[PDB]
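Hi all, posting the design record for the shared folder.

TITLE: backbone redesign
STEP: 1 of 1
STRUCTURE INPUT:
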């Protein structure tokens, strides 16, 4: 049923060496489609 990957799609961590940002392939799918509708007229 519930999965950690589904619960979180983006992770941001600050380290002494810099910053790290991780995103799941699933997070990408939502973002492209959401944008596709954004360009499209309502």
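Okay, here is what came back for every position:
SEQUENCE:
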């Amino acid at each position: 049923m519930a999965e950690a990957h589904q619960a979180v799609a983006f992770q941001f961590t600050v380290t002494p060496d810099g910053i790290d940002l991780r995103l799941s392939h699933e997070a990408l799918r939502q973002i492209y489609l959401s944008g596709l509708h954004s360009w499209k007229k309502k």
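COMMENT: The chain has one domain: 1-42.
Let me know if anyone wants the other runs.
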